[PDB]
Design a protein around this ligand. Sequence first.
Ligand code: GLU
Ligand code: GLU
Lengths: 257, 257
Amino acid sequence: TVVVTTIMESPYVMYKKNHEMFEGNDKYEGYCVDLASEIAKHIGIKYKIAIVPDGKYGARDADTKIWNGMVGELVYGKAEIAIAPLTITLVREEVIDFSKPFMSLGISIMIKKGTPIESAEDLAKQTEIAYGTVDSGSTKEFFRRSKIAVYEKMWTYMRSAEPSVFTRTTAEGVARVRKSKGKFAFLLESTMNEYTEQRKPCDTMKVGGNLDSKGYGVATPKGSSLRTPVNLAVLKLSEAGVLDKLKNKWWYDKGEC
Amino acid sequence: TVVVTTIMESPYVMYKKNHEMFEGNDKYEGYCVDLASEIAKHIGIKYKIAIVPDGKYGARDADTKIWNGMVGELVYGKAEIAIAPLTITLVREEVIDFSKPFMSLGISIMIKKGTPIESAEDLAKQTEIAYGTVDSGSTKEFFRRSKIAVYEKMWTYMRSAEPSVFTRTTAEGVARVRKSKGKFAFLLESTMNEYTEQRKPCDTMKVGGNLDSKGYGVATPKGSSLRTPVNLAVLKLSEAGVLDKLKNKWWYDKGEC
Ligand SMILES: N[C@@H](CCC(=O)O)C(=O)O
Ligand SMILES: N[C@@H](CCC(=O)O)C(=O)O
């Protein structure tokens, strides 16, 4: 039985209503729950969903050099596959493998409706509206590593901001936007942003274009016999239009705004 | 010296003005020429650009089972790397390797301005306007393999259309659109469609959303020592914003419309 690391993130992995009464994998629903089922069917494996204990995507400690989050679970052999909205990055590719992308996305800006912001330049040239990102993920790293002037300005602000503009989870960032009367904006991937925009109370929206262009991949530890089957499975699902059906199912069919 | 297979396709690889006076690689300019230079710099290789002899992207002969085009050049050891708008697909992944995507795209519809078509459904429910794709590529295969009703109908038409609706090159498809007074539409990737829309005489446009979501990758033959360095190089260029800069350079800085 293959241990699948994933993260509680709507609409990828969520608790079913009355999840307490279900056992194991049956506790959960979402895009990545369906993707896990599809891949397992294609490659012929039994699997168990294990929600990442620390609740993080994955970053390397510049102190102890230890990987946390889902990346950590793979690196240290606690899980055999990661089926979550895990961004394909250089630093991660150096320690784990990724399938070709199952979803295409970029960093985006979330505002409370009515906020006078339409771009990253708009954010960077003012101080009245605060903004941040989730911790321990690719978005925080993006700003840390950027040599593009606008993003460097944004990082210089966010890195030193008090109280902290970095949130433990995406949900916490969204809640912060919703409660802050337009005085907090949140930087997050377009996929999560677009989802939230179609959820009650319909008070947030994505503004401007994406800051970058990248993808989520299904990840496996280096040397895994699952590497190739997983990659081919993702491409088959892509080409058969199943990934498009799954996105429509979890983002728009369920649309509430 | 590494042989780089590529294809004459604007704005990826084009002849410089007065190309006859230049030698070797310096005869050429474009997105993929710049990408080749960037990758070679990162991975420390000397290279020679060789335009694919048969002028094809790459498909397998359901008869001889022989791969043609750039895929063929890699499969049969005539080239060591492909740096071109070559789509990452299942069938190709079974015989060659691809880097993670350097560009994201989908199949799209090109029309002569004023053509009463705004979608794939619009095309499929009529017969007055003909439509086709380029031969020996991923777009033709998409329609061949689709089980989506609208696309199945389009394939059933295109496969048996007289005279042939399939063109040898993208340029031939574009010229056919331009010359046909709204009676021909062309199915091609969004990237090439978007490019053409900003080129004189500014008589074409992209209509509707993309039919799929996929990527171009830099390809290497199975067992190549260049596989990992090329993959990491693409991700480095992605993350440094170089891919975005190159797209802006060749599509929009170079806009005529
Ligand atoms: N998909 C991101 C998580 C969210 C973010 O950082 O925006 C990652 O893999 O780290
Ligand atoms: N990018 C395509 C070429 C053109 C097409 O088929 O649309 C390929 O690699 O085959």
